[PDB]
């Protein structure tokens, strides 16, 4: 389907949280948030939830203790879009019985032609 | 209908919370969260909300007091998907008057043919 039209929203979320991380942490953590690319990359590394993820997390939170509600929100706002989006498709996919009728009318009518 | 296409989402939720439980509790509770299978099984046992459920819960929370917001979230995020999904079907099932007309158009047309 148009499931790549979905990833546009996820890149928008990456973008907005990367701009946030740039506005918040560029002066203090330049290698991780000094550019938009660095913020994108650091958010991806945190989203991996791996060793490097906690490694990035710890100094940012030592310097700015509130920073956690940044990261957590990025993990929540993202995951709850997908799920919600992913739960809407199922509803918009359970409207295809009418589509089976569509094909069947195609059969009968294109014989009449 | 495609009600088994729904259970894919529930297995995705099981998967993500099992990966969470693995990342959080594997080192400290290996028999319950040392593998992905163990995490899946332990989450199912907790979702049962039975004697074994609280039995699993108590040492995990004694060791990590925050762990409750893990379990609770697993119980919430799950149940509020189902309900929400379950409340969307009803809306997408109250659409079928147009379907009844569909069949009635099938009748009048097939004789026409």
């Amino acid at each position: 389907p148009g499931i790549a039209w979905i990833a546009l929203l996820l890149l928008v979320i990456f973008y907005v949280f990367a701009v946030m991380g740039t506005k918040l942490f560029a002066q203090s953590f330049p290698e991780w948030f000094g550019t938009l690319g660095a913020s994108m990359y650091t958010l991806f590394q945190v989203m991996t939830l791996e060793s490097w993820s906690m490694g990035i997390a710890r100094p940012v939170i030592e310097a700015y203790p509130w920073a956690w509600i940044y990261f957590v929100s990025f993990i929540l706002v993202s995951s709850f879009t997908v799920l919600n989006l992913f739960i809407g498709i199922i509803i918009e996919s359970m409207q295809s019985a009418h589509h089976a009728e569509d094909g069947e009318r195609t059969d009968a009518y294109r014989d009449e032609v | 209908p495609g009600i088994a296409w729904i259970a894919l989402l529930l297995l995705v939720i099981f998967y993500v919370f099992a990966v969470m439980g693995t990342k959080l509790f594997a080192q400290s509770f290996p028999e319950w969260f040392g593998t992905l299978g163990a995490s899946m099984y332990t989450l199912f046992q907790v979702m049962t909300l039975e004697s074994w459920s609280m039995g699993i819960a108590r040492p995990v929370i004694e060791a990590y007091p925050w762990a409750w917001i893990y379990f609770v979230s697993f119980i919430l995020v799950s149940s509020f998907t189902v309900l929400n999904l379950f409340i969307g079907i009803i809306i997408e099932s109250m659409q079928s008057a147009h379907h009844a007309e569909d069949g009635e158009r099938t009748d009048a047309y097939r004789d026409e043919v």
Partner: antibody
Amino acid sequence: EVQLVESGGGLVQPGGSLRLSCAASGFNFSSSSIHWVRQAPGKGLEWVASISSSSGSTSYADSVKGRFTISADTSKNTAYLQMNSLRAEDTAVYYCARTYGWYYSWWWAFDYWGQGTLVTVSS
Amino acid sequence: DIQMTQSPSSLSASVGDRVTITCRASQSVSSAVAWYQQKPGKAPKLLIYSASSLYSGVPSRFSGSRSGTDFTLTISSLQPEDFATYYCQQGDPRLVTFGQGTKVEIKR
């Protein structure tokens, strides 16, 4: 059983190259970070490089930036340190370490250390 | 440029004496510090992480303390197998520095 078996060191001519392998065994390699730390005979420890096995992210020391290159193959279940333009300073015993965490990643422990392998740069 | 100055370089104390090792950072790194034992020619082993927390398996005689910017490794009763070199560490993904080291020699 949770070990880091490293090899690939020895003798190499100046201006040459050498590959160091660190095969992990007994733990989850992807979830960990792998580290190369060197000790020249008669000095303290010196950090060389670090890499996320799963994420692929790398971080190098300013003293060996560009010349060395750290990598990690999760299928081979092993990290690697490729060394180029080797010199007299690089003559040292190199150690492989890890941080396998949720604990030690929020502190950069490093928890476990490989046993060490010597790299002597001579003619 | 996160500097770790470890002192002293060498020390010699009899068995049972109380050994102290200082490691000063240049700024508030509040608890990123770790402490390592290295016996000669062998692999370093983690004694202390979080600058206070003790690694699983370390004897009780090793302890880690903090004063603002100055971290300390203390051995209560020096044992003859505690002959080693001890290193204090920083912590970050993007940079890691160690101390100059402190070689603990036994007296008998």
